Amino acid sequence: MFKAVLFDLNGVITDTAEYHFRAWKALAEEIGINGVDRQFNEQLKGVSREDSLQKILDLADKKVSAEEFKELAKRKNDNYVKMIQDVSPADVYPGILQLLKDLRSNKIKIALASASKNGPFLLERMNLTGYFDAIADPAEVAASKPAPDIFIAAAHAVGVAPSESIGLEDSQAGIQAIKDSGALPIGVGRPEDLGDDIVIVPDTSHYTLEFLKEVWLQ
Ligand SMILES: O=P(O)(O)O[C@@H]1O[C@H](CO)[C@@H](O)[C@H](O)[C@H]1O
Ligand code: ALF
Ligand SMILES: [Mg+2]
Ligand SMILES: [Mg+2]
């Protein structure tokens, strides 16, 4: 059987993308940059804070000092952290808590493979920390999806080969990252968006231990 499940955060466990959009758009507008729209933000799925900011600067060919860059990223992050202060166990997506319980009871390792450095805070707010055997640290493993690095790191963090792992993802870049790690992807979303070549479920209530085992056996 598969020996680990490697979880993306946003769009899988819960979704805080709206708050990232609001905060990046506010930052861009404060510094006179146009183009941070919903289409642009959908392209930031699985993308590090620093790569995200650079994409925004690139809209206007804006050059900033390293210190200015750090301050811009901090300003946006502070705003986003204020926006997520009310996240609680209520925000957990359907099926996810039961899946975590079932994986743990079956002695299957659980790791977070998110690009967001806010992962630990979010898991704590949602009362999920105790289910996670490890959290891959994007400050140590900074490559944005679709690079496989974060998933490889998550598997190493629980002592399981990626080839013996399942990855759960809601984004194109994240699915590719899982593929290139060697793990088996199961997407959540639409096949039009995420592919007709892998198993996709329409929402997270379909992520059950039984379903993961069915997919693994096929
Ligand atoms: O600022 P962190 O929370 O570290 O990173 C975030 O990660 C998000 C992906 O989960 C991405 O969409 C954001 O643009 C990025 O700021
Ligand atoms: F939390 Al993600 F790709 F949605 F790392
Ligand atoms: Mg995601
Ligand atoms: Mg989706």
From Swiss-Prot:
The gene is pgmB. Its cofactor is Mg(2+). Activated by phosphorylation. Competitively inhibited by alpha-D-galactose-1-phosphate. Belongs to the HAD-like hydrolase superfamily. CbbY/CbbZ/Gph/YieH family. This is Beta-phosphoglucomutase. The lineage of its organism: Bacteria, Bacillati, Bacillota, Bacilli, Lactobacillales. It is found in: Cytoplasm. It comes from Lactococcus lactis subsp. lactis (strain IL1403). Mg(2+) binds at residues 8, 10, 170. Its main location: cytoplasm. It comes from the Bacteria.
